[PDB]
Design a binder for this molecule. Structure first.
Ligand code: SF4
Ligand code: SF4
Ligand code: SF4
Ligand code: SF4
Ligand code: SF4
Ligand code: SF4
Ligand code: FES
Ligand SMILES: [Ca+2]
Lengths: 576, 905, 145, 145
């Protein structure tokens, strides 16, 4: 019974609880390769089901994801309710270490769902993105406006009838948008942003400028009364591109989401595609992927910590050494594009042991230097403690994952809770904080994660398995190159995989991983074709950016700047 | 019948085999030797499934799904482990000898062997020994041969020999050195040899014409179009790349031309890529040829047309219905002339009157295969309507099919059927001026002049029905053969009468109508087929107009001082001296054409019209079926200065500029609405294809596959800035990948067949309701007219017998599949395949002239002395001289004409 | 199929020889002495059967020559691991019903019985490590386990 | 100092030559379709002896993301990403590299692979039966059974 098998999860106790509560005919269980019980709920029972799951003895406390899907061109929907569109809700029980996906089927003429914001406040931005990209209205939403596209945008780009490729450039629309930027402040209505009490004659409205983004600030003097972060300035159409590229040729796009991560961003996508293909990778592939993911985690953590130290007023050679090793292994520093379906693009180069040994023997003195510069610095400690602090309740209700969630004391790491890529064969600790997640605790947790990633790299170096760097599956893409260049059937397989694409049988797969800034997940729907029917990417920085108004309510602008530096986020991760 | 595949219950046809039943249900079973059109033979052993004796059976047995009836209560498994292992083993055995050739193989990305290799999941070679090799043969200009890539699936020989009745392809040798080819190098002689490139699942037989300018199937931009090279109207998928027409694939149509084209349609597209085509409007002022853009071409043309007293228009059977109608609206109904001669127009409207007023059902091309007796009167079907000849061969094999059905042999078990029906066949009687290519299967062939062919038809009609007019002067031996024909036709449940306009004789069409009416009066299920000359001969006949002689008279008398010639060279329908003199007399000649013709020297204005690859339109079949063709590519995407518009667009904007002094580049649906409003007989062309607002769940239909490559590079040498995607306002297709080509989409127009896991022409299985049947949501195209309630009367104009008169030589028409049709004989690959210009003579007449075979004789027709070398024709009759119609200098209006001063040069 | 000395007491009937894992056939038995190597005898048999294929159907036409080449390698001592398993798979997949006629099951009956009884000669043929790939200079091979 | 680059570095793209000196590319178009950006455009041409080669080969380097998917997709190792990164330009049109800007005079990173030594299709210097692991063509009229 492999890990990629299609299961309906009828033995999950949440299915029996839902059956005993709402009756056996109130929902439809779908068998998937997501590893999660997927149930189809009536629209009229969605809030009741969400409230019931919120009040279980080990409750489902986190809205992990919420998005839509255009089901109109989907030809393999056997055992599925009739739908033109659908909305899915991914909910996580942390005490249970379980999750459930709820699906609401919608007809094309009635695209409205009850708002989920009364149960989970992060549903606000998730529903704004679903409205923006699919045109699905959420009744009761306070400010249901566009969040990726500008407000003067026609059409919903993630619909199947929307043309993906770039339209013709018009200078006149550019001058019109520049004009709209000219007196945006003069024609600023604080009703189009969800704000209130616009000019008491003491409230000031400003715009501001990890990526560049705007946030409108309502200030009473220097105190923040409300704020609305304006995002979507870095929207690259990555999911729509997932429908326009083959399963193989989408991998560089996985790189450029969360561009400080690289192979870390490759990992959930190729793991989900291997679930769709039914591929179990060999152990050497697992250790190679873990080693590259931990090298890039170290690189991203070092950049984040070095940026935080400089911003407060309390770094390049280490990242250069990591980039040199990654450049030797993959041929590229920043966007390696090196993981593959079934394995990795090449074997490890001869001499990788020497470079990794030189990196690991040179790092612990730098680790002591960073711990002295951060944990033992009083100016950093007095600047960073207590500013924008939240507890477990606020991290659970806002979908906060990564260092902030563990700083609240919730011991939730994906590598330990739901292991992937052979992470269960490594000995490493998960650092957690007290009950308070402020800037100092988050940065301290990132430093401890740096130490643990160095331990994982030491274990990767010490016993690196000998074996194949690609799986023996027929759907390993591409095949091994020497057999491609020598053998006719391997040439045939390579020819068809790199041109039309590999045929993934119709299914749905899911994979969440512990990325450098939180939990990154790929949710892939295959319609039996050589491209993805739906590529949904859940990124931590979207959810972390949504939590900003609920954490610096009543703080100062300098506190907001420190909070922005303390959040490990990048804007490409937010907007994707 | 009820079958259970992998425990899932399905309802199928019990008369089918399990392979076709399971492919029709959407299941995937790999296969090589089976084809929907050829039947099942059980050769390749690829299609193995596991059959169980009942539901409570676990052992099972590997059976061949193509050789197993899908009977009631069947239990099979496709996903059985032993069946999957065996299918992977069969792919492995084919892979042991297969050459390492995929990059340099024209079948790559379009190869069925690649697809079934991947589908079985075989990607690991454990064979370490040598591969057998083979020398290749030269199969002529169209088909390239690579015997290394063969898998010995026997599809080629079964198609070419048991289906198309070709004689020069076969299997040779033995155990694992089995060779598939000709007995020696030379051109493949079948008129339908080009279907090998889609029948062969590998790259053995490949399109040599495509191989010259090769590109892969993902790089092709396809559109659904209609073949323009004769009247049969076979659906095609032209595909282009880099602004040139690359390939013609067969487009499946279960009502017309299901899997097969003829070689003329498949390989005669090369005129589209000629470098002398007009690409811009060009105005002749003195000796200068000023290039214009579209707007000032319309302005100058409208000024000269406004200042002229009478403007006449000359259409063409090449042009679509929309172009001819737009010319008819520009010049008026009373000033519009069809571009064909008076005799051709008389024969065409007589065939139209027979088809839509004779009360006899005219069959589609696919339905021809189900008739029980065939009488072909005057039509060289293999050289003029070739796909009808292939359907006639299927109708002939119908007798063996019935004989095997009488012994309870299943209809897919083709080898048993052919063994039971050894040489028995349904009756075929062909009649021509000489021997035809249908004579191998014909029960009788009549070689005679067209008067005697008509008299034989009239005599058959009189012998079937005594109310038909009698023929006086029939010899006793010819009378005995007439009674043979009459006993065969009267004894058939479904007799079919084929004739056409190519014989050059009105009386032949009248005799065919008499035979069909006589059979209808006896209660038979008789059908009648009329083969026209060109792609839109029937549409031009339905629209109607004056003859070309009347237009030439209007030009010569000076009553018309402006002539707009649409897609017509005018030399195939009238004498070149008269045409040139009449056009030189006119002070304004405007030629709207996509080919460089001879009359463009006299033309004051030349409009660069679009051919079928660059235009949309509607053409009418020889059976009255209205079919839409769609534009394949935008000609201005690569060359920005090319002004190559549709002919209806040119003429509509010219009419707008003539009336209101403003141009109007209209839309196609507006022109079609104008046609159906103004000509009620052409009202059915609205339903041929849906309008440009048609969507599949909101999106358009994609012209190119989803993996189409080179988007930011194919034009980068011209400019690095990617141009705007060319907009299509005329049709529901988009000029990009951003559209729909799903097999389950509710549409009838499929630009190309592709499904995941099926990259070959076998992907047409996914687009059909059942394999080899119709398209899932109906075949495209609509019949314009229904069968009349009442028929015609008998034609009492029985001609006299042919009398050879001294000094005069009756011209007997000889049609060639390569050479007679104008546009295809302009194609450069046809020149090697084209016969040399040979004038045919009886041995008696050649001995009378003192002329041997090969010596050149000169004759004067219409004051033009031309010289050709002599071929001796045994089957011709004395007093007749045989000429190749449609060749260079021999216009097809010479059929039935007489010749003077035939003497040795 | 080949039979051993213990089967020599069987009455020459269809049912008795069929029950022993062979068939009566033409009932014209051929005796094999100890000086005859079974790999050479089966190589000769399969050479006949492969060159007497009619070429119609894939398994006989294309898998009997594979058995011939494996047997030639084993006869020359150039056998490689997986050869006996390939022969057994060829025997299983050329049985009754898999091929168009009965030529190929009759072909694989002696190979079946010779591997069943005299397997030691066939394993004595295997002397080389398995290889069908040569090294390509700039490409590290996928070292399968 | 010059910047050190590892041999795997994904920089400027070149087209290489086989060890006999002929250009490796057979214009099979696998690199163009495997390009996610779609910045490769080429056309197949053929010599008198039947050898496939690119008539033109152009790469839009203003579009190329140097991902190496084409080199991975190349079945002849013709297209290769090389350790060079100094490709800055004054005009964006000059970033379209034709075949005269890509075809270097050597084998690049894969020094010995010749695809035409593997292909069954015959060219000059290699008739039928001269590829690797290929038997000579037995004529169908041969006297041997
Ligand atoms: S016929 Fe098919 S499998 Fe054989 S070389 Fe050509 S593309 Fe490859
Ligand atoms: S040449 Fe083609 S069609 Fe003929 S047997 Fe070989 S693979 Fe089949
Ligand atoms: S029969 Fe006529 S319409 Fe059909 S492919 Fe041939 S030329 Fe074209
Ligand atoms: S098993 Fe029979 S039908 Fe098949 S190739 Fe061999 S001899 Fe011919
Ligand atoms: S490196 Fe990538 S982007 Fe550049 S040409 Fe090759 S496939 Fe295209
Ligand atoms: S993949 Fe290689 S051989 Fe094929 S067209 Fe591209 S560079 Fe040429
Ligand atoms: S398809 Fe049935 S044996 Fe070939
Ligand atoms: Ca158009």
């Amino acid at each position: 019974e492999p890990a990629w098998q299609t299961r309906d999860h009828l033995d999950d106790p949440v299915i029996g609880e839902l059956r005993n509560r709402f009756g056996p005919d109130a929902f439809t269980v779908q068998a998937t390769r997501t590893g999660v019980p997927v149930v189809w709920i009536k629209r009229e029972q969605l809030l009741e089901v969400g409230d019931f799951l919120k009040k279980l003895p080990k409750p489902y406390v986190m809205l992990f994801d919420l998005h839509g899907m255009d089901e109109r061109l989907r030809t393999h929907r056997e055992g599925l309710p009739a739908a033109d569109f659908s909305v899915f809700y991914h909910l996580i029980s942390i005490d249970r270490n379980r999750d459930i996906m709820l699906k609401v089927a919608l007809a094309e003429n009635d695209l409205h769902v009850p708002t989920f914001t009364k149960l989970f406040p992060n549903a606000n931005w998730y529903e704004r993105e679903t409205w923006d990209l699919f045109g699905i209205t959420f009744d009761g939403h306070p400010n249901l406006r566009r969040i990726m596209m500008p407000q003067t945008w026609k059409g919903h780009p993630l619909r199947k009838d929307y043309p993906a490729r770039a339209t013709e450039f018009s200078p006149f629309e550019l001058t019109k948008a520049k004009q709209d930027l000219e007196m945006e402040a003069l024609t600023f209505k604080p009703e189009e942003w969800g704000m209130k009490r616009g000019t008491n004659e003491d409230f000031m409205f400003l715009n501001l400028g990890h990526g560049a983004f705007r946030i409108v600030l309502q200030l009473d003097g220097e105190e923040i009364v409300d704020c609305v972060p304006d995002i979507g300035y870095h929207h690259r159409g990555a999911e729509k591109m997932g429908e326009r590229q083959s399963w193989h040729s989408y991998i560089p796009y996985t790189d450029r989401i969360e561009y400080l991560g690289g192979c870390v961003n490759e990992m959930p996508y190729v793991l989900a595609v291997e679930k769709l293909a039914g591929i179990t990778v060999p152990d050497r592939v697992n250790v190679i992927r873990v080693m590259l993911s931990e090298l890039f985690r170290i690189n991203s953590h070092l950049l984040y910590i070095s940026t935080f130290i400089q911003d407060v007023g309390a770094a390049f050679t280490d990242r250069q050494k990591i980039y040199d090793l990654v450049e030797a292994i993959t041929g590229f520093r920043m966007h390696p594009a090196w993981f593959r379906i079934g394995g990795v693009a090449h074997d490890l180069p001869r001499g990788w042991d020497r470079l990794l040994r030189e990196f690991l023997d040179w790092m612990p003195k730098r680790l002591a230097s960073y711990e002295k510069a951060a944990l033992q610095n009083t100016i950093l400690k007095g600047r960073s403690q207590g500013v924008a602090a939240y507890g477990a309740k606020e991290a659970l209700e806002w979908g906060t994952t990564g260092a902030g969630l563990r700083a609240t004391g919730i011991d939730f790491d994906v590598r330990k809770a739901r292991p992937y890529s052979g992470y269960e064969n490594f000995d490493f600790e998960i650092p957690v904080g007290g009950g308070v997640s402020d800037c100092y605790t988050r940065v301290m947790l990132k430093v401890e994660e740096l130490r643990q990633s160095l331990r994982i790299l030491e274990q990767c170096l010490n016993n690196m398995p000998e074996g194949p760097f690609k799986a023996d599956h027929p759907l390993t893409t591409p095949p091994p190159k020497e057999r491609t260049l020598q053998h006719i059937e391997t040439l045939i397989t390579h020819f068809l995989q790199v041109s039309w694409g590999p045929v993934m049988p119709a299914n749905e797969s899911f994979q969440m991983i512990e990325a450098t800034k939180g939990i990154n997940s790929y949710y892939l729907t295959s319609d039996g074709s050589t491209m993805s029917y739906r590529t949904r990417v859940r990124t931590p920085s979207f959810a972390h950016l949504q939590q900003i108004p609920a954490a610096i309510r009543g703080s100062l602008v300098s506190d907001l700047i420190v909070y922005l530096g303390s959040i490990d986020f990048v804007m490409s991760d937010v907007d994707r | 019948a009820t079958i259970h595949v992998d425990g899932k219950e399905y309802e199928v046809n019990g008369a089918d085999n399990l392979l076709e039943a399971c492919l029709s249900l959407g299941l995937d079973i790999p296969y090589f030797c089976w084809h929907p059109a050829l039947g099942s033979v059980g050769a390749c052993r690829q299609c193995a499934v596991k059959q169980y004796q009942n539901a409570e059976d676990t052992r099972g047995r590997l059976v061949m799904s193509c050789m197993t009836p899908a009977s009631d209560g069947t239990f099979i498994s496709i996903d059985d482990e032993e069946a999957k292992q065996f299918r992977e083993s069969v792919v492995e055995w084919l892979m042991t000898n297969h050459p390492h050739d995929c990059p340099v193989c024209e079948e790559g990305g379009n190869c069925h062997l690649q697809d079934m290799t991947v589908m079985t999941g075989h990607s690991f070679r454990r064979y370490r020994f040598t591969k057998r090799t083979h020398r290749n043969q030269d199969l002529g200009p169209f088909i390239s041969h690579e015997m290394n890539r063969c898998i010995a699936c026997y599809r080629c020989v079964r198609y070419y020999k048991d289906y198309a009745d070709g004689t020069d392809l076969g299997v040779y040798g033995a155990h694992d050195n089995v060779y598939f080819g000709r007995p020696e190098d030379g051109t493949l002689e079948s008129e339908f040899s080009g279907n090998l490139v889609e029948i062969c699942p590998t790259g053995v037989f490949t399109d040599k014409t495509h191989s010259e300018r090769y590109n892969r199937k993902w790089d092709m931009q396809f559109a659904p179009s209609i073949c323009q090279q004769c009247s049969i109207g076979c659906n095609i998928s032209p595909g282009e790349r880099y602004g040139e027409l690359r390939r013609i694939e067969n487009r499946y149509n279960g009502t017309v031309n299901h899997y097969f084209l003829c070689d003329r349609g498949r390989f005669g597209y090369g005129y589209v890529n000629l470098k002398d085509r007009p690409r811009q409007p060009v105005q002749r002022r003195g000796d200068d040829f000023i290039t214009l853009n579209a707007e000032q071409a319309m302005q100058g043309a409208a000024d000269i047309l406004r200042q002229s007293k009478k403007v006449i228009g000359i259409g063409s059977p090449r042009a679509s219905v929309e172009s001819n109608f737009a010319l008819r609206e520009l010049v008026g109904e009373e000033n519009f002339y069809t571009g064909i001669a008076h005799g051709e127009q008389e024969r065409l409207q007589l065939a139209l009157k027979v088809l839509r007023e004779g009360g006899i059902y005219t069959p589609a091309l696919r339905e021809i295969e189900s008739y029980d007796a065939v009488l072909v009167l005057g039509e060289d079907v293999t050289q003029t309507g070739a796909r009808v000849a292939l359907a006639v061969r299927q109708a002939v094999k119908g007798k063996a099919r019935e004989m095997a059905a009488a012994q309870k042999v299943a209809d897919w078990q083709i080898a048993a059927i052919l063994n039971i029906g050894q040489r028995a066949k349904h009756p075929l009687f062909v009649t021509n001026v000489d021997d035809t290519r249908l004579d191998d299967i014909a029960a009788w062939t009549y070689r005679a002049p067209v008067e005697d062919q008509a008299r034989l038809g009239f005599a058959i009609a009189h012998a079937l029905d005594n109310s038909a007019p009698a023929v006086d002067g029939i010899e006793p031996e010819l009378q005995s053969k007439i009674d043979v024909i009459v006993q065969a036709l009267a004894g058939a449940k479904k007799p079919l009468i084929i004739s056409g306009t190519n014989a050059g004789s009105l009386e032949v069409i009248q005799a065919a109508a008499n035979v069909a009416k006589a059979l209808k009066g006896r209660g038979a299920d008789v059908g009648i087929t009329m083969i026209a000359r060109s792609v839109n001969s029937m549409g031009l006949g339905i629209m109607g107009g004056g003859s070309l002689e009347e237009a030439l008279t209007e030009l010569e008398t000076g009553r018309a001082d402006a002539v707009v010639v649409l897609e017509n060279d005018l030399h195939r329908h009238a004498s070149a001296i008269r045409v040139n003199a009449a056009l030189a007399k006119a002070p304004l000649v405007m030629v709207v054409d996509h080919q460089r013709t001879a009359i463009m020297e006299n033309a004051h204005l030349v409009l660069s019209a679009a051919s079928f690859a660059e235009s949309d339109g509607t053409v009418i079949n020889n059976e009255g079926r209205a079919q839409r063709f769609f534009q394949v590519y935008d000609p201005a995407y690569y060359d920005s200065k090319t002004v190559m518009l549709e002919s209806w667009r040119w003429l509509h904007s010219l009419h707008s500029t003539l009336l209101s002094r403003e141009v109007d580049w209209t839309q196609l649906d507006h022109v079609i609405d104008a046609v159906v409003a103004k000509i009620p007989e052409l009202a059915g062309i609205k339903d041929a294809a849906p309008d440009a607002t048609f969507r599949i769940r909101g999106q358009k239909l994609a012209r190119e596959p989803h993996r189409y490559s080179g988007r930011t590079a194919m034009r980068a040498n011209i400019s690095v800035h990617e141009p705007r995607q060319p907009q299509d306002i005329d049709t529901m297709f988009t000029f990009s990948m951003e559209g729909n080509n799903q097999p389950t989409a509710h549409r009838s127009q499929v630009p190309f067949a592709w499904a995941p896991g099926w990259n070959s022409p076998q992907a047409w299985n996914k687009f059909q309701d059942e394999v080899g049947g119709k398209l899932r949501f109906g075949d495209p195209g609509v019949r314009l007219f229904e069968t009349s309630e009442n028929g015609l009367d008998y034609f009492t104009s029985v001609p006299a017998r042919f009398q050879p008169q001294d000094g005069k030589w009756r011209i007997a028409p000889y049609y060639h599949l390569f050479g007679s049709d104008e546009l295809s004989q302009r194609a450069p690959v046809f020149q090697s395949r084209m016969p040399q210009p040979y004038i045919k003579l009886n041995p008696a007449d050649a001995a009378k002239l003192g002329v041997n075979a090969g010596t050149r004789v000169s004759f004067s027709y219409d004051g033009n002395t031309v010289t050709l070398p002599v071929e001796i024709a045994e089957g011709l009759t004395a007093g007749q001289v045989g000429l190749p119609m449609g060749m260079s200098g021999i216009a097809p209006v010479l059929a039935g004409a007489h010749l003077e001063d035939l003497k040795e040069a | 199929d080949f039979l051993t000395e213990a089967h020599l007491d069987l009455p020459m009937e269809f049912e008795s020889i069929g029950k022993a894992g062979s068939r009566l056939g033409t009932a014209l038995a051929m005796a094999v002495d100890h000086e005859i190597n079974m790999v050479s005898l089966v190589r000769n048999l399969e050479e006949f059967f492969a060159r007497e294929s009619c070429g119609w159907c894939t398994p006989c036409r294309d898998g009997l020559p594979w058995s011939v080449k494996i047997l030639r390698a084993l006869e020359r001592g150039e056998g490689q691991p997986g050869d006996i398993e390939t022969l057994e798979q060829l025997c299983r997949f050329l049985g009754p019903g898999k091929t168009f006629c009965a030529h190929a099951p009759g072909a694989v009956e002696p190979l079946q019985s010779a591997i069943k009884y005299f397997r030691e000669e066939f394993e004595a043929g295997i002397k080389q490590p398995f290889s069908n790939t040569h090294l390509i200079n700039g490409i590290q091979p996928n070292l399968l386990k | 100092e010059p910047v050190y680059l590892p041999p795997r570095y994904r920089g400027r793209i070149v087209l290489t030559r086989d060890p006999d000196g002929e250009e490796r590319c057979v214009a099979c178009n696998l690199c163009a379709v495997a390009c996610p950006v779609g910045c490769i455009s080429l056309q197949k041409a053929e010599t008198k002896d039947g050898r496939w080669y690119p008539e033109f080969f152009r790469i839009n380097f203003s579009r190329c993301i140097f991902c190496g998917l084409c080199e991975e997709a190349c079945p002849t190792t013709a297209i290769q990403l090389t350790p060079d990164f100094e490709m800055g330009e004054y005009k964006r049109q000059d970033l379209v590299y034709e075949k005269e800007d890509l075809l270097i005079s050597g084998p690049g990173k894969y020094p010995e692979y010749n695809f035409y030594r593997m292909a069954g299709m015959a060219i000059d210097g290699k008739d039928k039966g001269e590829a690797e692991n290929e038997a000579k063509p037995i004529d169908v009229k041969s006297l041997l059974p």
